Amino acid sequence: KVLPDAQTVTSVRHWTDTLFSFRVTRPQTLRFRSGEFVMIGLLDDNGKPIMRAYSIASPAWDEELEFYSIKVPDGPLTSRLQHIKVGEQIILRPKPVGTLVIDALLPGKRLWFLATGTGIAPFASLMREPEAYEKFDEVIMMHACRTVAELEYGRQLVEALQEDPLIGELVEGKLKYYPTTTREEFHHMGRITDNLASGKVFEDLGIAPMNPETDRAMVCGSLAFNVDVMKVLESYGLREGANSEPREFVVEKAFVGEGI
Numbered sequence: 001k002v003l004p005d006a007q008t009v010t011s012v013r014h015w016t017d018t019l020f021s022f023r024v025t026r027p028q029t030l031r032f033r034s035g036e037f038v039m040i041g042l043l044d045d046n047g048k049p050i051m052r053a054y055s056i057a058s059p060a061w062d063e064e065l066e067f068y069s070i071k072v073p074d075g076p077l078t079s080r081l082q083h084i085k086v087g088e089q090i091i092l093r094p095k096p097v098g099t100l101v102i103d104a105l106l107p108g109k110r111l112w113f114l115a116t117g118t119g120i121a122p123f124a125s126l127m128r129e130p131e132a133y134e135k136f137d138e139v140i141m142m143h144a145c146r147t148v149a150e151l152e153y154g155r156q157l158v159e160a161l162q163e164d165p166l167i168g169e170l171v172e173g174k175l176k177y178y179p180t181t182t183r184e185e186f187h188h189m190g191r192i193t194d195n196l197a198s199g200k201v202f203e204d205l206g207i208a209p210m211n212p213e214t215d216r217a218m219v220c221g222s223l224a225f226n227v228d229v230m231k232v233l234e235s236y237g238l239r240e241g242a243n244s245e246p247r248e249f250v251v252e253k254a255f256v257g258e259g260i
């Protein structure tokens with residue numbers, strides 16, 4: 001007996017006791033755009049498919065798929081998914097959707113990535129999307145978590161990109177990674193909303209206050225984070241709007257609920 005739409009696991013890398021990433025074989029049928037998400041899952045006691053929405057953390061051009069996942073004890077899926085091993089499989093619906101796609105935007109000089117927690121996942125994909133560096137001139141990556149260890153997955157991803165011999169210094173003065181913690185001490189602190197309103201992120205990167213003038217950003221955090229951020233965006237003059245139609249910015253829930 002086989003598992004419908006089952007992909008094999010090629011690697012697992014634990015980052016903290018609540019965060020882990022892993023890569024799987026790509027369904028020979030999958031065709032997507034960096035930033036979209038799909039459904040993945042495992043089987044429970046009776047053999048029931050527990051499905052959950054997951055951003056594809058790897059760029060569209062990758063032959064393998066990568067996922068960055070939260071680990072919730074009691075979580076039906078993650079309490080299970082966190083134990084996945086190389087060779088083991090998972091279910092993966094090859095139906096890619098999501099509003100976090102570059103097409104949903106259109107302008108040019110800036111493409112901001114504003115995320116918190118695992119909401120970095122889609123940007124781990126987009127930050128490695130060639131289109132982001134062609135249809136746009138500068139990519140800002142704002143990631144805010146509670147502690148430094150939660151920044152690790154995205155910080156090592158960013159370090160590798162820049163330190164890479166060729167692709168590095170190619171994302172030279174294109175990508176600007178602005179990580180922040182809100183609990184642990186870290187050279188750059190403060191929440192994304194606050195640092196945008198107060199303008200710190202501007203006099204920090206030595207740039208021009210995010211104006212609705214052909215700018216652009218994608219938001220991915222909790223619901224409270226999305227509304228807060230959206231408000232702050234318009235506070236400058238940006239307007240929502242998704243998949244296939246000119247707009248100022250897009251958002252997506254990094255998860256449903258209040259978060260752990």
Ligand SMILES: Cc1cc2nc3c(=O)[nH]c(=O)nc-3n(C[C@H](O)[C@H](O)[C@H](O)COP(=O)(O)OP(=O)(O)OC[C@H]3O[C@@H](n4cnc5c(N)ncnc54)[C@H](O)[C@@H]3O)c2cc1C
Pocket residue numbers: 037052053054055068069070071072074075076077078079117118119121122252253254255256257258259260
């Ligand atoms: C558009 C979309 C994209 C998503 N992409 C990802 C992804 O990239 N990686 C990922 O781990 N999850 C992602 N999520 C959340 C995911 O779908 C599941 O909720 C997650 O896999 C946990 O499932 P669970 O069954 O173990 O616990 P759940 O029963 O689903 O939730 C239990 C509680 O844990 C909290 N929680 C769940 N997920 C998170 C999280 N990611 N960060 C902080 N708290 C959380 C919430 O409080 C939730 O109510 C996404 C959700 C949506 C709606």
Ligand SMILES: NC(=O)c1ccc[n+]([C@@H]2O[C@H](COP(=O)([O-])OP(=O)(O)OC[C@H]3O[C@@H](n4cnc5c(N)ncnc54)[C@H](OP(=O)(O)O)[C@@H]3O)[C@@H](O)[C@H]2O)c1
Pocket residue numbers: 116117144145146181182183191192193194224225228229258259260
């Ligand atoms: N004092 C307490 O006893 C206490 C406090 C918090 C949580 N808890 C337990 O922790 C649980 C969940 O809390 P948590 O640890 O996940 O904290 P959290 O508020 O969910 O933190 C997640 C991240 O998102 C940021 N954030 C939250 N709202 C935001 C907004 N509207 N705009 C921009 N950024 C925003 C946070 O910044 P900030 O860090 O600045 O908030 C933090 O970096 C609660 O259910 C509770 O049971 C207890």
Ligand SMILES: CCCCCCCS[C@@H]1O[C@H](CO)[C@@H](O)[C@H](O)[C@H]1O
Pocket residue numbers: 061130167
């Ligand atoms: C048309 C724009 C092309 C710009 C290049 C996009 C990344 S391409 C990517 O690069 C990796 C480098 O480590 C290789 O390992 C991998 O096989 C290759 O597909």
